[PDB]
A paper describes a structure:
Cytochromes c′ (cyts c′) are a group of putative NO-binding heme proteins that fall into two families: the well-characterized four alpha helix bundle fold (cyts c′-α) and an unrelated family with a large beta-sheet fold (cyts c′-β) resembling that of cytochromes P460. Of these, cytochrome P460 (cytP460) is a heme enzyme that oxidizes hydroxylamine to N2O as part of nitrification (1), whereas the evolutionarily related cytochrome c′-β (cyt c′-β) binds the diatomic gases, NO and CO (2). By contrast, our recent crystal structure of cyt c′-β from Methylococcus capsulatus (Bath) (McCP-β) reveals a hydrophobic distal pocket dominated by two Phe residues (F32 and F61), a structural feature we have named the “Phe cap.
Our goal in characterizing these aromatic → aliphatic variants was twofold: (i) to provide further evidence that the Phe 32 aromatic quadrupole limits Fe(II)→XO(π∗) backbonding and (ii) to establish the extent to which the Phe 32 aromatic quadrupole influences heme–gas reactivity. We assessed the impact of the Phe 32 aromatic quadrupole on McCP-β heme–gas affinity by comparing the structural, spectroscopic, and kinetic properties of wt McCP-β with those of the F61V and F32V variants.
Residue numbers in the entry:
A (entry chain A), B (entry chain B): 3 to 138
The structure:
Amino acid sequence: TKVKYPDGFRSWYHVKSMVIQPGHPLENPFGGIHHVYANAEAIQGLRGGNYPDGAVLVVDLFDYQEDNHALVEGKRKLIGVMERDAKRFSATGGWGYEGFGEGKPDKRLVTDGGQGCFGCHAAQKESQYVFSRLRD
Amino acid sequence: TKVKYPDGFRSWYHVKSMVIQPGHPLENPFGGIHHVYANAEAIQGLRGGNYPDGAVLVVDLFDYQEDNHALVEGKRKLIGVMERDAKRFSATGGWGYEGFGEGKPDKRLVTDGGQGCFGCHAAQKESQYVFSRLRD
Ligand code: HEC
Ligand code: HEC
Ligand SMILES: [Zn+2]
């Protein structure tokens, strides 16, 4: 019933990025430069296939610094993790939701079984609760 | 003596990202959100080894739109490509430098055999002409 730390996620397929700046409704706590990653099973889902159990999506959130008309990556703030298990995570739509502070396996963040995460992701029911779209 | 189009680069290792905003000295043509990718060979060099022949670094440059304090990736502007061949690219320090407009193999951007690219990358001679640092 716990989401595994997605060991090796930095070697996975980079789906997309986005910057959330001060003023954005999600600045707290989603502020920063984020990178979405997908394991092979998650790519099958993202391509328009179905998500197999064992699909993992990671959102990797960095602080950034302003550096002369450049936003430069600073320290990692956290990672968000969605792990597909249709039966074990059925209460949250077949994805298990976890956060790791600074991306550290020992800093698990979620305290409500992921109901808060799922509450926002539920808007994306028709893309199987995933916001990110595969781009070329 | 032409750099090959790096087919499949989107499936490679994501090294790092950066945003270059308007007013940056390199705004033309490096303005946008960029993602650096490395093939397996290039990872050896980034980890502290010698870059082997066949190492390829790609910088993938997107337009973005500031939409309510989110920077949102738009169309791809171009890719920059560095291809390691100590002998074939000896005039430019063993890297071949090329750009592909909109990331399309038929839109080559470099017109000076990469001397302009090399002129700036030469400052990084001590890190084998590569600016990007591997981060976890
Ligand atoms: C709305 C108020 C959200 C809440 C609460 C949570 N997330 Fe979410 N997440 C949200 C958006 C708008 C996006 C897309 C970002 C983009 O660049 O397009 C995401 C994305 C993720 C991802 C990546 C997969 C995807 O659905 O695109 C993961 C792995 C993820 N978020 C995890 C996650 C967790 C663990 C949360 C609770 C701790 C959480 N999110 C809440 C919107 C919102
Ligand atoms: C200085 C005036 C530059 C010129 C001219 C060119 N490049 Fe360069 N490039 C520059 C910097 C500061 C960076 C690092 C960006 C980052 O996020 O840290 C880069 C990076 C690249 C890369 C990625 C590999 C690396 O060295 O980090 C590639 C593949 C690359 N640049 C290609 C490229 C080409 C093809 C150029 C001539 C058309 C070229 N660059 C010019 C600085 C400068
Ligand atoms: Zn200025």
